[PDB]
Amino acid sequence: SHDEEIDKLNEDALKLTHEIIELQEKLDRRSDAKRIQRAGSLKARVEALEDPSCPDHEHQCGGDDPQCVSDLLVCDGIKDCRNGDDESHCHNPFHAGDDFVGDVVFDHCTKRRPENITLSVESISVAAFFPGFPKLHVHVNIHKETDEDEVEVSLPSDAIYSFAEDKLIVYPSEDDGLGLVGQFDGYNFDRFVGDIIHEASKEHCARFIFHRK
Amino acid sequence: SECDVLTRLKVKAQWRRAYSHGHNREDFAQAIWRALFAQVPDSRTLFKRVHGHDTTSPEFQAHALRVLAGFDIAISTLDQPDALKAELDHLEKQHEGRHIPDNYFDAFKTALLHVLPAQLGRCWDKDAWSACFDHIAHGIKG
Amino acid sequence: DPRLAANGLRLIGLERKLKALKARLHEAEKIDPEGFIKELDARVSHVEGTHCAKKEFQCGGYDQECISDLFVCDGHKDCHNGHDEAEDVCDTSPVKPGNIFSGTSHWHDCLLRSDHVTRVVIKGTIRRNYFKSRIWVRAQIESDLIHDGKKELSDFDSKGYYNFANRRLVLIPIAQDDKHLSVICDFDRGDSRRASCHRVLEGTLHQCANLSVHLQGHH
Amino acid sequence: DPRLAANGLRLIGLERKLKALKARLHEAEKIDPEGFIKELDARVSHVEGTHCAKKEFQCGGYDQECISDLFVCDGHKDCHNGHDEAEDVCDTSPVKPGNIFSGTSHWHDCLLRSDHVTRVVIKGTIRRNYFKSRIWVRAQIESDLIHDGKKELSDFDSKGYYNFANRRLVLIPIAQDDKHLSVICDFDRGDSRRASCHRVLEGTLHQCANLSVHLQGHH
Amino acid sequence: TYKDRRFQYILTNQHLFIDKLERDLHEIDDEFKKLGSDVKDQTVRHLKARISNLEGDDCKEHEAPCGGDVPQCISDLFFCDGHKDCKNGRDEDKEVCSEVPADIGSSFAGVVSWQACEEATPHHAVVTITANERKEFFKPRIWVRAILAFEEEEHEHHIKTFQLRGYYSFGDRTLALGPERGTKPVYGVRCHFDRGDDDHADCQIVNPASLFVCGNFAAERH
Numbered sequence A: 001s002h003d004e005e006i007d008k009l010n011e012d013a014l015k016l017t018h019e020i021i022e023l024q025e026k027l028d029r030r031s032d033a034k035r036i037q038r039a040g041s042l043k044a045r046v047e048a049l050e051d052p053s054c055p056d057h058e059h060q061c062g063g064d065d066p067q068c069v070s071d072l073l074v075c076d077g078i079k080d081c082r083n084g085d086d087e088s089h090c091h092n093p094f095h096a097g098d099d100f101v102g103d104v105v106f107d108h109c110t111k112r113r114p115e116n117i118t119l120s121v122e123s124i125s126v127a128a129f130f131p132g133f134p135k136l137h138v139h140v141n142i143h144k145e146t147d148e149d150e151v152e153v154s155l156p157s158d159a160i161y162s163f164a165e166d167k168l169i170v171y172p173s174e175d176d177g178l179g180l181v182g183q184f185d186g187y188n189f190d191r192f193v194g195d196i197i198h199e200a201s202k203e204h205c206a207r208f209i210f211h212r213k
Numbered sequence B: 001s002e003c004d005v006l007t008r009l010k011v012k013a014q015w016r017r018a019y020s021h022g023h024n025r026e027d028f029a030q031a032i033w034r035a036l037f038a039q040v041p042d043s044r045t046l047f048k049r050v051h052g053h054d055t056t057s058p059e060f061q062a063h064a065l066r067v068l069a070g071f072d073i074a075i076s077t078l079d080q081p082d083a084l085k086a087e088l089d090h091l092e093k094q095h096e097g098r099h100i101p102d103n104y105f106d107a108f109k110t111a112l113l114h115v116l117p118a119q120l121g122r123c124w125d126k127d128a129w130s131a132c133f134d135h136i137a138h139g140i141k142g
Numbered sequence C, D: 001d002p003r004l005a006a007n008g009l010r011l012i013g014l015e016r017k018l019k020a021l022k023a024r025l026h027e028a029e030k031i032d033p034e035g036f037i038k039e040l041d042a043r044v045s046h047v048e049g050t051h052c053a054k055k056e057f058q059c060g061g062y063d064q065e066c067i068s069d070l071f072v073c074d075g076h077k078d079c080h081n082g083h084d085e086a087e088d089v090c091d092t093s094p095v096k097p098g099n100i101f102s103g104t105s106h107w108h109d110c111l112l113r114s115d116h117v118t119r120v121v122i123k124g125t126i127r128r129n130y131f132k133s134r135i136w137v138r139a140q141i142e143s144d145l146i147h148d149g150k151k152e153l154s155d156f157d158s159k160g161y162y163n164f165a166n167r168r169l170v171l172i173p174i175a176q177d178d179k180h181l182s183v184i185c186d187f188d189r190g191d192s193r194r195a196s197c198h199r200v201l202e203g204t205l206h207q208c209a210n211l212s213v214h215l216q217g218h219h
Numbered sequence E: 001t002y003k004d005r006r007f008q009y010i011l012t013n014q015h016l017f018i019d020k021l022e023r024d025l026h027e028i029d030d031e032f033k034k035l036g037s038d039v040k041d042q043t044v045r046h047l048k049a050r051i052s053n054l055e056g057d058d059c060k061e062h063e064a065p066c067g068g069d070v071p072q073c074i075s076d077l078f079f080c081d082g083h084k085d086c087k088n089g090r091d092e093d094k095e096v097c098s099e100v101p102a103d104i105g106s107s108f109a110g111v112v113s114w115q116a117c118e119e120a121t122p123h124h125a126v127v128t129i130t131a132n133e134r135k136e137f138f139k140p141r142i143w144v145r146a147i148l149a150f151e152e153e154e155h156e157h158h159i160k161t162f163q164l165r166g167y168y169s170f171g172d173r174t175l176a177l178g179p180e181r182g183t184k185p186v187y188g189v190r191c192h193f194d195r196g197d198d199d200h201a202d203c204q205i206v207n208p209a210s211l212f213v214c215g216n217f218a219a220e221r222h
């Protein structure tokens, strides 16, 4: 009686709770951040296959009403896109202390010809008056063990991050024209492609796929 | 470093790479300006005549371009000391009477030295640029 | 009232939850998986191109059969797979009268205008039952110009057609010698809501402006 | 709830306690008994000296056997007790690349500088598998000089070696005729974290500065 | 404060209780997962089909069952012709009238046990629909052109191929094939799609004249 009816009440209430949370789960699955990211990555591949929508040194604001904006004006704290896109990219993928480990794709110019390269972020300096191009101090760590010897290296280097190009530029520390450039997918930020390029010939002679460790 | 014959040549070549292609030139100019005004926002009052309150206004665009043109004459004549002295005297006259603290010139320098490597993105020398800018700025001040 | 009161509190909780979910619906509508994939399919298919001639319509997506674009949505099955009469293909809503497509016009030829709003306003459609391959569209082209310190509307009446096969709306100015440029829109974004347009010269199809309209629609 | 509540209070007490102990861990880490004794052993052993020749390595602590320092950590047991291949002896972490030793340089010859920070930054190591007796080190030597009212960094690239037997890192300036003095560090404090260094002239080993670096390490 | 730590004490071990409950739930769910699983819908469909076939029907030659709750038999010639002849309309059902078993490119293969005609040991047979035509005025049949081919060893290199023509009948669920016009009456094929789907069939390779069974294969759509 006064317990059977109460129990039936509690039961119906539990079932309602279940149906409600089910709706919530549909909502969550639809807006799942990871899914949206993957979508962005796919869209990005397509964009890579298409003709550039903007002049060589500009930035596509995107949206249903496209617009091109100078690369030097992205993430400077002043809205230049009509949709403010230039001022919402502004999350630096690199934080002081981050490690990225890159595995070799091809390579025919690096000194040690290593299997993997660890890029360690040591510090970040952001000029308040020029926030669109943060400066990083990073170390390029390599460990190659051949027959004749075992070599370990940790090359301190200076870098710049471009929010405009979603791109890390690591200036060479040794006496070769060899710089590291990490291109970000635009949406991932846990993985970039690290191409090694001769600062001069612009020749692309090595590539590593870096992942956030 | 100091403004050698050689490092002047280096600065001259790099300035060619940065300025000579009138595409993003007004944007280059305006970037320099946003940086400057970000450092020393009190300096905007000196530019009332030319709409310093809105760096996207056509009047201020015209301004920043006039500036970069003057600076271009200065850089272009680093290897022609007579002409350089002439242009520097001219700029000095255009600037005398205006109460401009060294402060503001340091702001300008810092702005230029941050926008430049963003423009070139590659092979550039901040020490040479520092030296030669110092020479030009000293010329404009007196 | 034992724990009946507690259960009541639970019920208030559930009410609150439901309210919140209903609120989430607005944000949920901003995500269109199927539409996103249809867009990507469109764009990729554009990068791929086709093996068909101009004025031809390729049947499936992978399919090898070509058809004259004079046979597309004419009421007769011409593709081995009937794609030329498919519902997605034959959708008439890009030019449903009442539609107001708005976008920003970016000029780089002909005229020396700064970036500005343009509206394509569909005013009417005729579709002959003896020739359904095309819809004859009449529309008004409006432009908000901030020419001389103050704002001013520049509008003109225009006429043309929507062709199903290439998903293209062509509007040339009705008896408007008055230097009003034609407009050509491609509904190439996978839907009937967005289009990639150009302001062009009618005779030469030279592109004087880039314009991207979306439906938005309601003045 | 009889004294169940009391017991609950006790439990909150224990939680509080645990939090406090976990806090004490930081202060507890500042005390290294084993390391302290290792340091004292080092310093005392230095005061004692050895009966071995220069370029020789004494086996145990009390032990009387001497060995050539070309045989130390070469992969072969040369001491009657195998000390020349022991793990403490052969530890390669004083020159693990990435290490940044910092210290204050006190000048009393050669240069007229006031006391100032110097960093030895290990940039790389090579250890031939056919000659493990020594590690070939490449490093960057940085100095913060407050020379003329304002601060200025004075850095140079250098190269040398770490020798296990005498625990010594020698770094001479890579092609730096430009009056950059060499640096010689002795990891004689019982660990791989602190070193007693000198700025010296390479040819004569004359000591121009006293420098004591500790690892600290992270810019 | 102290009251804050009491409140926090209550919060802390309600979350603990929730965690325990979650762990226990996972135990029970794991215990439930080890009770086997549900069944493949194909296995059930095929089982039901086999039972149905064993049950048979009271239909006459040139009739086929309508299927459904109340058994009714109607003519071969009345299935899928646009008029409902079954009391329940099943002769015009979209599944019944699936034209998939006769689709161009459809091929059904399986290993043949021979009983005559061919003295080879069990190998595959494949029959592939190469063309079709369904006349709009006579829809209860789909006329098809097919090809019967045999799997033969790497050493044979002189494969045998038989060109066939015939029809698919919806009510019969039957693909019936005979020799193409002027092509030596060697083989015919009778496939019965009685597994409950458009993807499996019981085939016989027969003599076109006598319908004498030369061999049987269990056909599967590949």
Ligand code: HEM
Pocket: B043, B046, B047, B048, B049, B050, B066, B067, B068, B069, B070, B071, B091, B094, B095, B098, B100, B104, B105, B106, B108, B136, B137, B140
């Ligand atoms: C070496 C860097 C600089 C160069 C090359 C430069 C050059 C110029 C030039 C070409 C003009 C145009 C004058 C005319 O054509 O009438 C000008 C005007 C002016 N400059 Fe500079 N300048 C520099 C730094 C600065 C500094 C740091 C300030 C202090 C914020 C400053 C304040 C002004 C002002 C207030 C004007 C006039 C604005 C107006 O037209 O109302 N300049 N300068």
Ligand SMILES: *[C@@H]1O[C@H](CO)[C@@H](O)[C@H](O)[C@H]1NC(C)=O
Pocket: A101, A115, A116, A118
């Ligand atoms: C680099 O590669 C080697 C094998 O070639 C592996 O043993 C090592 O762990 C790798 N390091 C990292 C961080 O991936």
Ligand SMILES: [C-]#N
Pocket: B067
């Ligand atoms: C400068 N003005």
Ligand SMILES: [Ca+2]
Pocket: A073, A074, A075, A076, A077, A078, A079, A080, A081, A086, A087
């Ligand atoms: Ca901006």
Ligand SMILES: [Ca+2]
Pocket: C071, C072, C073, C074, C075, C076, C077, C078, C084, C085
């Ligand atoms: Ca048609």
Ligand SMILES: [Ca+2]
Pocket: D071, D072, D073, D074, D075, D076, D077, D078, D084, D085
């Ligand atoms: Ca040894």
Ligand SMILES: [Ca+2]
Pocket: E078, E079, E080, E081, E082, E083, E084, E085, E086, E091, E092
């Ligand atoms: Ca019928």
Ligand SMILES: [Zn+2]
Pocket: A059, A060, A061, A062, A085, A086, A089
């Ligand atoms: Zn963007």
Ligand SMILES: [Zn+2]
Pocket: A122, A137, A138, A139, A156, D219
């Ligand atoms: Zn460093």
